[PDB]
Design a binder for this molecule. Structure first.
Ligand SMILES: [Cl-]
Ligand SMILES: [Mg+2]
Ligand code: NA
Length: 208
């Protein structure tokens, strides 16, 4: 969308080419200008679990791709599925510019179509980590799908963003109540890149 394009424009103008940290800071800056830090939580989870195969559902401007890819060990892989071609185009430009393109496989399409292809087509055995940041109504069905397709092993980490605002209540109820998942909640704050709000004025004109 227009916001993601302006984020990319800002990065290209101000971030140091090939420097992933420079790119992240430039985006945090663009969003700042216009509980715990969201980027800090993602970094902490990845550094805690050291995934060699990491699946990202949803990519808007490549912020999350870059943040996660920069921390991966050599030869480790980020696979990113994004349904909107325009967001995927921007994400790849961001990833190229940030210097991490060698770690990222960006795939355009719907998660429910691509997920069952991960083993056969993208040489995945099981996934070490999944970052969920796409359409909220996909969180629980894709989670059940990942399981059904044999992509989860004991120890696989699911990390879901925005589970409160806009919210993924059904996703939360499932994994929390299930003995198949061990759940931890991290309070956070919404950031500019993620959302935007507005008010509507509606003046009644009569029955007419
Ligand atoms: Cl993003
Ligand atoms: Mg988000
Ligand atoms: Na649980």
């Amino acid at each position: 969308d227009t916001k993601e394009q302006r984020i990319l424009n800002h990065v290209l103008q101000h971030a140091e080419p090939g420097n992933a940290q420079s790119v992240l800071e430039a985006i945090d800056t663009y969003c700042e200008q216009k509980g715990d830090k969201k980027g800090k939580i993602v970094d902490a989870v990845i550094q805690e679990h050291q995934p060699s195969v990491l699946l990202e559902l949803g990519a808007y401007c490549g912020y999350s791709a870059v943040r996660m890819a920069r921390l991966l060990s050599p030869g480790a892989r980020l696979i990113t599925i994004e349904i909107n071609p325009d967001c995927a185009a921007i994400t790849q430009r961001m990833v190229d510019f940030a210097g991490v393109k060698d770690k990222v496989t960006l795939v355009v399409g719907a998660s429910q179509d691509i997920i069952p292809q991960l083993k056969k087509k993208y040489d995945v055995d099981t996934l070490d980590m999944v970052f969920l940041d796409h359409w909220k109504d996909r969180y629980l069905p894709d989670t059940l799908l990942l399981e059904e397709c044999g992509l989860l092993r004991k120890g696989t980490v699911l990390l879901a963003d925005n589970v409160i605002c806009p919210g993924a209540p059904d996703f939360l109820a499932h994994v929390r109540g299930s003995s198949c998942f061990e759940c931890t909640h991290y309070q956070s704050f919404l950031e500019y890149r993620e959302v935007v709000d507005g008010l509507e004025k509606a003046i009644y004109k009569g029955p007419g």
